[PDB]
């Protein structure tokens, strides 16, 4: 079983299951693509609906995670500035 593209994105998923302790979204990008393919052909309403809704939440949260990562980088830059001074 398992879809072809589902198997491809799953291959990448199993290739990077938990090698990301802290980051905005890197492997989660291919997971976003996976849920896109899924919802394009996913069944079971009610249980389904929350998956694309939360997918949109994940997209907005991806932008927010990019903001968090960039702001943490800014904090690190300010720290390096104070340390240098």
């Amino acid at each position: 079983l398992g879809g072809d593209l589902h198997a491809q994105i799953m291959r990448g998923t199993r290739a990077r299951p938990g090698q990301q302790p802290g980051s905005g979204d890197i492997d989660m990008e291919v997971l976003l693509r996976g849920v896109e393919k899924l919802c394009a052909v996913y069944p079971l309403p009610g249980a389904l609906e929350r998956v694309p809704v939360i997918r949109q939440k994940w997209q907005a949260q991806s932008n927010t995670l990019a903001y968090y990562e960039a702001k943490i980088a800014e904090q690190q830059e300010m720290l390096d500035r104070i340390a240098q001074e």
Binding site: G24, M28, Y42, P43, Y68, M78
Partner: protein, 56 residues
């Protein structure tokens, strides 16, 4: 395709539970990433404050 995917994918109903588990684990993974991001942010704040106190 309406009735076709309905009957087919409903029979696929056991498979989709794993897909739900995938999405749930993705959420938990980014949640732990958010925890690490918070750790980094607080680390930068505390370390910058310590460096300021050392040089002030």
């Amino acid at each position: 395709l309406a009735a076709a995917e309905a009957s087919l994918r409903d029979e696929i109903g056991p498979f989709i539970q794993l897909l739900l588990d995938r999405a749930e684990k993705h959420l938990d993974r980014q949640a732990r990433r958010i925890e690490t991001l918070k750790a980094r942010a607080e680390l930068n704040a505390g370390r910058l404050s310590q460096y300021s106190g050392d040089g002030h």
